[PDB]
Amino acid sequence: SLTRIDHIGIACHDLDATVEFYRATYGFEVFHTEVNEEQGVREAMLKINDTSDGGASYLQLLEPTREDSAVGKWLAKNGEGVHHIAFGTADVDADAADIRDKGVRVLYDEPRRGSMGSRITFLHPKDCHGVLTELVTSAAV
Amino acid sequence: SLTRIDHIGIACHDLDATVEFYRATYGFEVFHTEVNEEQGVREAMLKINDTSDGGASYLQLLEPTREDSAVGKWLAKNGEGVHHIAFGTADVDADAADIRDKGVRVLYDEPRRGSMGSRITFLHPKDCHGVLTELVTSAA
Ligand SMILES: [Co+2]
Ligand SMILES: [Co+2]
């Protein structure tokens, strides 16, 4: 079951400049930063609030680490801005299987590693009225 | 201060078809629907979760009622997709004034009515690294 907005993915050319913009303008601190070599992105999560399902809502600021990354190619085409939205669930595997069975294109055959040890998958934006959509389960405890 | 993600604003050609997609695919349902002739939209709010500041987070699906709308013009140029993000605050007026004073332009000189009797304003996307950013104070 999708029970929260987990994050908004925001692509930027310069992660350190964009992080400083969110910090200086709104007072939002970096919760966690990491590099995902497989995706070719450096990410900063800014925690905005906690959620009623036990999770949290973040801004996920993303910079490409190389030209051949999905995010680097998206930025070259569209400029900086909102890249994707993410919904949280206790069961990414079951939800992804349910949505694939409805005919939605699921970009990965199985969930992959995401921010802070999460497991994630994506839905094709052309099946989601133009919105690149991520499904997220937080790290297991 | 900005204490939650209040909503994601998603522009679409056909609100009813888009709502059915979110209902059928994710099991979301419509919390509130309204026609706003000032903004020139029809909008549906789908409540996804409650938030730790006492508010809630929504998807806001927006269809144009006329082509001379911020949203109607944006769809012609961009196609369907994410149009804005919105942050909740207890005092939209105070936070907009503080943010203007930092050099980020505010699109309205005074806040306007938004969905569900909220009080809203927007920050200029070219001052926000390409993200059209709304500030929202919910009704009592
Ligand atoms: Co993400
Ligand atoms: Co809005």
Side-chain angles (χ1 to χ4, degrees):
Chain A
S1 179
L2 302 177
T3 54
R4 68 180 176 278
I5 298 169
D6 191 82
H7 63 265
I8 304 164
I10 297 176
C12 59
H13 291 306
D14 179 341
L15 184 63
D16 292 353
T18 301
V19 162
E20 176 60 20
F21 168 78
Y22 277 87
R23 217 297 296 162
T25 311
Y26 308 122
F28 301 153
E29 295 291 343
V30 175
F31 192 68
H32 176 90
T33 187
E34 71 184 76
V35 175
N36 188 312
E37 282 298 335
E38 174 223 281
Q39 278 207 166
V41 297
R42 174 181 184 232
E43 311 171 319
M45 290 286 259
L46 282 47
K47 186 176 171 163
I48 313 306
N49 58 270
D50 286 298
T51 59
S52 46
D53 68 349
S57 297
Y58 309 84
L59 304 176
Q60 188 181 66
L61 274 55
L62 283 335
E63 184 188 327
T65 56
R66 58 176 187 261
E67 230 163 58
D68 65 309
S69 59
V71 170
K73 298 172 161 201
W74 190 95
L75 276 165
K77 182 167 179 283
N78 296 282
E80 303 191 302
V82 177
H83 174 262
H84 64 272
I85 70 177
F87 299 113
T89 170
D91 195 349
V92 59
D93 301 282
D95 284 332
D98 187 62
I99 289 166
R100 182 190 286 169
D101 291 352
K102 293 170 192 300
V104 172
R105 284 164 285 183
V106 176
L107 297 188
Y108 308 147
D109 56 1
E110 65 189 26
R112 298 186 185 174
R113 171 178 111 247
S115 171
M116 293 180 291
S118 61
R119 289 183 66 254
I120 73 74
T121 193
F122 288 92
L123 310 180
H124 196 303
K126 288 187 175 171
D127 291 333
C128 300
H129 292 274
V131 180
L132 178 61
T133 304
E134 197 174 11
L135 314 178
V136 177
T137 300
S138 298
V141 175
Chain B
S1 70
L2 277 60
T3 55
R4 66 180 179 283
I5 297 166
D6 189 80
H7 63 267
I8 304 168
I10 295 169
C12 64
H13 293 306
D14 176 344
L15 181 56
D16 293 349
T18 306
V19 161
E20 175 60 20
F21 166 74
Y22 280 83
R23 178 182 300 121
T25 307
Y26 311 118
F28 300 155
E29 191 54 73
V30 179
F31 188 78
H32 182 82
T33 318
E34 67 174 68
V35 169
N36 182 328
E37 292 288 337
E38 186 177 24
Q39 195 205 142
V41 289
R42 177 174 160 249
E43 52 161 289
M45 299 288 266
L46 285 69
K47 186 172 168 170
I48 314 306
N49 54 270
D50 288 306
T51 62
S52 56
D53 67 346
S57 298
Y58 307 82
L59 302 177
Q60 181 173 78
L61 302 187
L62 302 120
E63 72 174 359
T65 53
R66 57 181 148 94
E67 281 87 297
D68 220 318
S69 175
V71 170
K73 287 213 294 296
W74 187 99
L75 281 165
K77 276 177 201 302
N78 291 284
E80 300 192 301
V82 178
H83 174 263
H84 62 271
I85 71 171
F87 295 106
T89 165
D91 194 341
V92 58
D93 303 82
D95 282 333
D98 284 354
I99 290 164
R100 188 184 291 107
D101 283 350
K102 294 177 180 171
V104 172
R105 291 172 287 163
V106 175
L107 289 191
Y108 311 147
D109 288 346
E110 294 293 333
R112 293 185 183 178
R113 180 181 179 290
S115 65
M116 302 173 307
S118 58
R119 186 181 173 78
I120 68 79
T121 194
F122 286 91
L123 309 179
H124 202 299
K126 293 297 172 175
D127 296 350
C128 297
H129 290 276
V131 176
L132 177 59
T133 302
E134 194 176 3
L135 308 181
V136 180
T137 296
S138 298

